[PDB]
């Protein structure tokens, strides 16, 4: 009966070292607004997520809408947060 959880790694322009945070939701249910809340960083950002495209393989996909579902990579989320 354990609560849902997704491991989230994200890179910012400032740091060469990525940040690690956990979101209390199942991958597939996690939305951009969930991700933004975990990051909790004000400013004008773009958000790219590591994803598997069926034609091109590993890609970075951008997500715009707050209610939009975040793609995962090997059951986790790997993200780039760019100012």
Residue numbers in the entry: 355 to 437
Reproduce, without paraphrasing, sentences from the article in which this PDB structure was first reported.
Three proteins, Dvl, Ccd1, and Axin, play an important role in β-catenin-mediated transcription through formation of a transient molecular complex which is translocated to the plasma membrane in the canonical Wnt pathway. Furthermore, Dvl, Ccd1, and Axin can directly interact with each other through their DIX domains which form the same head-to-tail structures. The mCcd1 and zCcd1 DIX domains have a ubiquitin-like fold with five β-strands and one short α-helix. DIX domains of mCcd1 and zCcd1 are arranged into head-to-tail helical filaments by parallel β-bridge interactions.
In contrast, the zCcd DIX domain is assembled into single-helical filament-like structures consisting of six or seven molecules per turn with a pitch of ~80 Å. The mCcd1 DIX domain was mainly eluted as a monomer with a molecular mass of 10 kDa, whereas the zCcd1 DIX domain was eluted as a dimer with an apparent molecular mass of 19.0 kDa with its monomer included as a minor state in the elution peak. Consistent with this, the accessible surface area in the homomeric head-to-tail interface of the zCcd1 dimer is 590.7 Å2. In addition, the interface of the zCcd1 dimer has two water-mediated hydrogen bonds. In Site 2 of zCcd1, Glu436 (strand β5) in the head-binding molecule have two characteristic electrostatic interactions with Arg368 and Arg395; however, no interaction is observed at the same position in the mCcd1 dimer. Moreover, the side chain of His402 (strand β3) in the head-binding molecule forms hydrogen bonds with Tyr364 via two water molecules. These results suggest that unique interactions observed in zCcd1 may contribute to stabilization of the single-helical polymer. On the other hand, Site 2 interface in zCcd1 was stabilized by two electrostatic interactions of Glu436 with Arg368 and Arg395 in the single-helical filament, despite residue conservation in loop β1-β2 of mCcd1. Phe397 of mCcd1, which is close to the contact surface with loop β1-β2, is replaced with Tyr365 in zCcd1, thereby changing the molecular surface from hydrophobic in mCcd1 to negatively charged in zCcd1. The substitution of Tyr365 with Phe in zCcd1 DIX decreased the apparent molecular weight of the mutant compared to the wild type molecule, making it comparable with that of mCcd1 DIX.
